RNA sequence: UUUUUUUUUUUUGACAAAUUUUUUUUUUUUUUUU
């Protein structure tokens, strides 16, 4: 492995321990490792691979676009894009980067209060060039509600019950993806009631122990 | 035309930051202390490597040049400027 | 180039102070009168370090071999761990914590090894400081038969604190009959330098408890053939090694891999009378420290001269002698009169080397600082460079 | 958060602008946590011990958060004059 | 900007604004009383003029209008009452 | 709060005059800022320097919070605070960026110059502008020694100083070095005023 | 001593219809005896 970064090390030495954590201070991740070792579980999903042409004097730069959808089942997904001369290595750079771009899910309930959370906790929206998504909390036994791809995400994304709305062209899964991806991270970002109560405000782990996990020298 | 090569130009630059003792201002001298200093592969190349260090020299000797520093040069830092006494706070 | 003095505590206790270890935070201090004694490195610059001093009385007999271990695991807790041999051959553990508002260090013991090991005679130890190779921290220890002992330290095990010290492994004598092992080390590649009062250096893989190599005396002869501090460079394979002819200090440093030898540390002229034994120090070598940037090597001799050696140039870098006044000039070389040893007797005991600011001061960050103790039971401390 | 016999859950409980009060959420990597001192006598550091101030992304963005950030520090107790709360 | 109290502003920052945007609407037009050069006694008169006024008893010219503020003719003194 | 001895001195205001760090701006004071001190006639508006000296005292309260010292970076593409910058880095443990930023500094390692900061200081918020963009991007905290009409972008604990003359960035940047000398170090604040002639820092010439 | 200084421009209309392209994870040996 050897990590670049200060996040890199810090995983590596059993410092961090929970992705949670990195979430509440809000440290951007660079290395897909990093990630990968805190969360183990978590298996990508190809939705769809198109091609893309540049045009050339000569002819044309039929590069490929790939779409990855990466998850576990417990409110962690990440949305990944890239574009490649080849397949393969379009796929494999997309789940790298879709790895990098984890974001949480604050899941929770349509009405009743019972043992664990099933649906999305208030109605967002997520806009990405003409398409809108509105996610909205469904009650116990109804499933996911969606279009085939955004019912996958949902599938991945670890949540059960589920009404979606969209508008605009939704043929051309990129922007519906996206907006899907936006409206799921935006479900942290919106004030309940239950979160009116002052925190004390932790302090980073990369702030506690910098010293004793910094940029490393050691010629020899 | 007869414009000088990145290998030619970079190595050379790379040869007066490491050892800028040595490569006196005369080409044929350089020439021969080339080929002891440091390993080159054709003749033509290790003498446009020689030309160009003989230049460089030249145009060091006249002012610093800005790319290129050799320890030498270093010195100035405390002592950079507490310069020139004006002779004859308030008021 | 030059090494400016912080401070110097005199009359720490009442017998020698034999070995002197640092973290973060302080530096512990053993010695033969049976006080465990924490130094504080958070100093003032205007303080004696016998105002920030905190002692406890251990064992009666005396305590030559002392470590220290300060790191984090689990959120934030500060786990101080100092384990010490005394001269009866006990083996004893203490976590250092402070009080909240108060600030007094107490010394909380900790008898994490049962009664049937805490039995046997040990001698030298360390703690292998690890980084997620293992699952938790490692150490290791000497004894009188040379049976090298290993653990697998577990401060946590289902988060709560329950220490335990499972047994990795015991690494048995090198040659029969038995040898007594004189010190040890351990590095973070994860190699076992076990030394040996012979000039017998044992070298052990950590992972199937196999020895992969040794060396033995380049005295084939007894004048003072054994090794007297076992020594690695952090990251890299250097490793450094120390012993003696009839009355002097001969360092030797080797590769770990192939074995292969590398320089033997040491100064000519005629002030030696010409010199067949190409020899570091004109008295025993006490100890030896690498610095934790890796490059340039301390070494103190019983002849009171730190002597500094930069392993990239082969050659001594500058010397300081702690207990006589001799700065300024250094014509440098070993004194060595027709009877023995050197006209300078001073006691010099232990060396250290300290990160990158643990101090605190002018002489703090920008430079690297040095701790070492003596006979007359002054210890003190050193910063370095001098050009910031 | 809490379901039916207690017991909390909605795994991690985000931070909150010190300004504001608006959620910072994980990819709003524009917000800041700053870290002040507590001093004692003759001043200095005492390592360990911190006042922390976290500051959202957006109000950085829109280039207030020095005023919101000079009251923070002055209605807490680590200042006299500064900020106006009479503009 | 941000966080402020409006309630109470500053005389310096609330003289500088116009009568219709402070925080209770309040007109800049003190009243003033003349000592005319012919009598001796006051005249009561608002300071924008409107009219063109002369005095009380010996009508001649106290203060022509304009754009603004009424100008009073020639050296005559004044109060703000 | 801080210790009375930690308040604005005499001797520190007439160094201040005399720098002419008290100088605003010609055009405007941004309203953005409070910092101003009543105007002068034909001419610039003058600054609360009392509010200045408070300012310093928290950003280096903040330098001193921060654990390594050397993650703490001087941003300097104003030649006239270069020379600072480094004088600066010498005496703190903090590193320095003189010359060109070169972006991705702090924005993904491969190149040599990638540094990750704990904190950044800043000279000029207006032509260093690509260096506190850059601090956005990855969690950074930034303190700049702001002028009146110079921009207000990302900059938290902003010093309202002059930023024109010779004689101002190296005092204030001096003044920085000897408060995180005050704090976690060896001077004591009122018997030592520190013998280190603020000459030491500004420009060349030539 | 805002401060120098410039001069122009034909004719060229068309080109028969139909006529490229698409996929996902990645992995190589040989040897008995005392």
Redo the contacts between chains.
Sequence with gaps: WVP???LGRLV????I?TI?E???????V?EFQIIDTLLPGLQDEVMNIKPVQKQTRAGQRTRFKAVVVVGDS??HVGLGIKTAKEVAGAIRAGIIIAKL?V??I?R?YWGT?????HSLATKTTGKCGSVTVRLIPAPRGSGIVASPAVKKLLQLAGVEDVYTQSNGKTRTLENTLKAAFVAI??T????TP??WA??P????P???????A??????? | GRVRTKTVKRASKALIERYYPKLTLDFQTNKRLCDEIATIQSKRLRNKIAGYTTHLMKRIQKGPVRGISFKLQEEERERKDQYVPEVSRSN | KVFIATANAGKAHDADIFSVSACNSFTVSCSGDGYLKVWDNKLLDNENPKDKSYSHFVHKSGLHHVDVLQAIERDAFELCLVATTSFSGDLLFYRITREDETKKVIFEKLDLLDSDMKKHSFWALKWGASNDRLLSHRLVATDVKGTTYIWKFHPFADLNWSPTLELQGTVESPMTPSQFATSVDISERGLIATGFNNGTVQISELSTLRPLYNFESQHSMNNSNSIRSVKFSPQGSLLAIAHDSNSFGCITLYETEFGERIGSLSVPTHSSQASLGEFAHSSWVMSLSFNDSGETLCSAGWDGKLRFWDVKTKERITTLNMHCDDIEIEEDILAVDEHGDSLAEPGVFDVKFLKKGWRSGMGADLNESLCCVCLDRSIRWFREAGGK | MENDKGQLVELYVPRKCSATNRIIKADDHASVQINVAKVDEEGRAIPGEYVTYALSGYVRSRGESDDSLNRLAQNDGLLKNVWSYSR | VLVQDLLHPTAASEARKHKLKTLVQGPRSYFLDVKCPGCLNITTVFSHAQTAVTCESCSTILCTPTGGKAKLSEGTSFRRK | SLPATFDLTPEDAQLLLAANTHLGARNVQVHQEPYVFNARPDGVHVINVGKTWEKLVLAARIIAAIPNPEDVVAISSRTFGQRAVLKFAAHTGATPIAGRFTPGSFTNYITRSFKEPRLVIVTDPRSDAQAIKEASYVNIPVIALTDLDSPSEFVDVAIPCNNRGKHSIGLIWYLLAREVLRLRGALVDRTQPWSIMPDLYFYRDP
Excluded: C, M, W
């Design positions: 670049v970064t200060k590596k030495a059993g410092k321990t949670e990195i979430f509440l201070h809000s440290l951007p660079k417990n409110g771009s974001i949480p604050r929770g209060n019972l043992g664990q959370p991270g935006n942290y970002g919106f004030l239950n979160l002052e925190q405000l932790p302090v980073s990369l702030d506690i122990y910098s010293d004793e910094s940029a490393q020298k050691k010629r020899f």
